[PDB]
Each structure stands twice: as C-alpha cells, then as structure tokens.
Ligand binder design. Structure first.
Ligand code: HEC
Ligand code: HEC
Ligand code: CA
Length: 350
C-alpha cells in the first residue's frame, strides 16, 4: 500500500484510477526508464536525456534522439511531473503522463526513443527474452495473462515518474521550520513574493509553477505566458520551430506563450528557456529586470521587451546589483539534497 510521505503543504497527486501506485510498479518503471533496450535501435534510454545528476535533465540546449536528430526544445525535468497540470512546454492536451509518454516513444518528428509499428514487437520480445523482466512485470501486473506489452511498459514508467520527488530543498526546510533562511535569501524571497519582482504570479505555488494539480483540484488554472524572449518580425513572433501555445490552437495571440516551469532544482537544470537560449540564471534575472530580451544580432534579432504579445506582469523593473544577487541567492535554495544522489532514483543497471 503506497505511502506518499509528503510534507503538510503537498497534497497527493491525481493517480489514474486504472493505474494504482505500488512499489513493484515503481521499481519496474525505474528499470525501464534506465534501459537502453527500450529504444528502437538500442542506443537510448529515457535517462539519456533525463540524467539524475542534473535533476533529470540534459545539460544540453536541446536533446539528441536515437537516430541523431535534435529536439526543437530543451528537455525539462521529470521530477515532480506527477503534479503538473499540463505536461511539456506548450500543450494543454497532454494532462496525463500515460498520454504524454507516446511522444518520446512513438513520435517521429523528431525520433526520440524510436518505437514504430515496424519494430513494436521486436522491442517487447527483448523484455520477454529476459529472466528478470518476466518476474517484474508478472509481480507488478498479477491480474494479467500476458503482462509484457506497451500498455504495461507505459504504466510502469508512469508509476516511477510519480515516485520521483523529495521535498528536500533549503526552501522546503524553511517552510517546515527546520531551517532559517540567510539574510540574502530572505531578501530574495521577499522580492520573489513581492509585487515588484512578480515571480509568485507564475512560479509561486508549492510546485514553484502556476499549474499545480493534485488529487483534489477542481476547475484547474492552467495559464500560459509570453515573456518577451523574441520579436522576430516586429509583431511579436517567436522564431520557428517554437511558437508555443500557437502551434496547437492556431490563434495568433497565443504566439510565444509557454507553460511556466517549476523552479525546483533550477540551479541544476541549465540551460534555460524553452529552447535553451539563456545560459545562466544571472542572464535570466537581467532579462526580467529589463522587461524582456533584446537580441542585437543576426537571424533572431528583434526586441521582446517591446513585443505585443508579452504578459501584463512583465514590466521594466530596474533591480540593483544587490537585489539581483539576493534573488539569485533565493533561487539556489530551491535545489533538493536527496534527489540528485538517492539510490531510490539512481540507475539500477550500474
Ligand atoms: C532524446 C530526447 C529524449 C528522450 C529519449 C526522452 N525525452 Fe522526455 N523530453 C524531452 C524533451 C526535449 C522534452 C520537452 C518536450 C516538448 O515540450 O517539446 C521532454 C519532455 C518530457 C516530459 C514532460 C515533463 C514536464 O515537465 O512537463 C516527461 C514526463 C518526459 N519527457 C519523460 C520521458 C520518458 C518516460 C521517456 C522515455 C521512456 C522520455 N522522456 C524520453 C527529451 C527526451
Ligand atoms: C507572467 C509570467 C511570468 C513572470 C512574472 C515570471 N516568469 Fe519566469 N517563466 C515564465 C514562463 C512562461 C517561462 C518559460 C518561457 C519560455 O521558455 O519561453 C519562464 C521561465 C523561467 C526560468 C527558466 C526556467 C526553466 O526551467 O528553464 C527561470 C529561472 C524563471 N522563469 C524565473 C523567474 C524569476 C526569478 C521571475 C521574477 C523575479 C520570473 N521568472 C517571472 C513565466 C513568468
Ligand atoms: Ca533547462
């Protein structure tokens, strides 16, 4: 029977009623997440792009799929993903990890894991060909005649992902009362939650996002935001291939709108932004201070501070070098102790 083991302030996540949590399901998912044999040609596991060492992200601006194509976007973290209202960077239709998983697995455009109908069965057989995997699926899905399929692979990995969290940060300790925040950290903190810096509007939930969804959430929030990273045409256009919410609705005023990412482990998940185009957290704050980014040079040139689509809440906010460092100091309190080195989420294959 699954113990959530949550702080007071985190309610349990919504679990799809036909895929209940269990420890057998968790460990199977962990083995499959890290197994290079789930990809079409056997070169990549999920963990290739979602490294533990980096809070389950890549360290690269974009990622490299199993046939060697680049992804159009930066690989976000999978930690805490059980609480995300909408999964990836800009898609209101992906609202379940089970559903989302089909993209990395079967998506071409571009190939990531590289599972097609041509190799579908071949992959599955690889797990039936294995002694240890037969125990696991069997022990995890006991009500099933044939318990190694793709519905079973998705269910397991989904369970694993819901088990990936540790509300372990200095910020979390602070909120529980086990820790005092630094003078710098307090001053960054008061900025973050103040109507000058404004970060709590979009990064101010206990998930440090504004799409926090648990198992009690009714009438969910779900907003998206243009933050003025670009204005390619002088009309607020973001460069192809990343239009954000526009790419799904076709509505012109959703151009450059993205989900606000959770800021948990932000210190560890650089590069930043939807396309990895901001190298450091110092440059991020520079950008918020100016109400947007100005690209002075080449193909991406334009000024996002002046974009028409930009959010109401991002204005020019002349923050002093002091206030910027205090705010940077506060973002560094959002890294987890456990997560990066816990045996629980480590590669089980060595
Ligand atoms: C070679 C690259 C690559 C592989 C392989 C890959 N991912 Fe991803 N992952 C991405 C990128 C890039 C995104 C961002 C997608 C987007 O919005 O365009 C992503 C997004 C996600 C998200 C949404 C997270 C959020 O915060 O909303 C989850 C969950 C996820 N991946 C899990 C998986 C699982 C499970 C596997 C394989 C079993 C997998 N990933 C394989 C690169 C990859
Ligand atoms: C009204 C919306 C809004 C406000 C205000 C806002 N953000 Fe964001 N933030 C976003 C969105 C949306 C993105 C993703 C944008 C993209 O990649 O195109 C983002 C991206 C980020 C990233 C990179 C995240 C990642 O996972 O790669 C950091 C760091 C960040 N914000 C911190 C801040 C700080 C610090 C403030 C204010 C002091 C702030 N934000 C104010 C919505 C906002
Ligand atoms: Ca990143």
């Amino acid at each position: 029977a699954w113990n959530w083991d949550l702080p007071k302030y985190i309610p349990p996540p919504r679990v799809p009623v036909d895929n209940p949590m269990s420890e057998e399901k968790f460990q199977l998912g962990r083995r499959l997440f890290y197994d290079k044999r789930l990809s079409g040609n056997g070169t990549l596991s999920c963990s290739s792009c979602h490294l533990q060492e980096r809070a389950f992200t890549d360290g690269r601006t974009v990622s490299i799929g199993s046939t060697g194509a680049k992804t159009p976007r930066n690989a976000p973290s999978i930690a805490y993903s059980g609480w995300h209202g909408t999964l990836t960077w800009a898609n209101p239709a992906l609202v379940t990890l089970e559903r989302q998983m089909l993209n990395p697995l079967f998506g071409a455009d571009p190939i990531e894991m590289g599972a097609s109908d041509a190799n579908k069965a071949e992959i599955v057989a690889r797990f039936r060909a294995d002694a240890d995997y037969r125990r696991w699926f069997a022990a995890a899905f006991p009500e099933m005649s044939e318990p190694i399929s793709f519905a079973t692979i998705i269910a397991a990995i989904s369970a694993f992902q819901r088990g990936v969290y540790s509300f372990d940060s200095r910020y979390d300790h602070y909120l529980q009362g086990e820790a005092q925040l630094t003078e710098a950290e307090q001053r960054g903190h008061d900025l973050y939650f103040g109507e000058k810096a404004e970060c709590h509007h979009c990064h101010g939930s206990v998930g440090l996002d504004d799409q926090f969804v648990h198992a009690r959430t009714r009438e969910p929030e779900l907003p998206f935001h243009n933050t003025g990273l670009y204005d390619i045409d002088g009309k607020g256009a973001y460069p192809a291939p990343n239009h954000g919410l526009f790419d799904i609705t076709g509505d012109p005023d959703d151009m450059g709108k993205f989900r606000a990412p959770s800021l948990r482990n932000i210190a560890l998940t650089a590069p930043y932004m939807h396309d990895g185009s901001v190298a450091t957290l110092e440059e991020v704050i520079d950008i918020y201070s100016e109400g947007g980014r100005k690209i002075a040079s080449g193909p991406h040139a334009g000024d996002g501070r002046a974009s028409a689509l930009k959010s109401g809440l991002i204005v020019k906010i002349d923050l002093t070098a002091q206030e910027k460092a205090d705010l940077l100091a506060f973002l560094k309190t959002l890294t987890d102790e456990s997560l990066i080195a816990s045996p629980r989420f480590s590669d089980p294959w060595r």
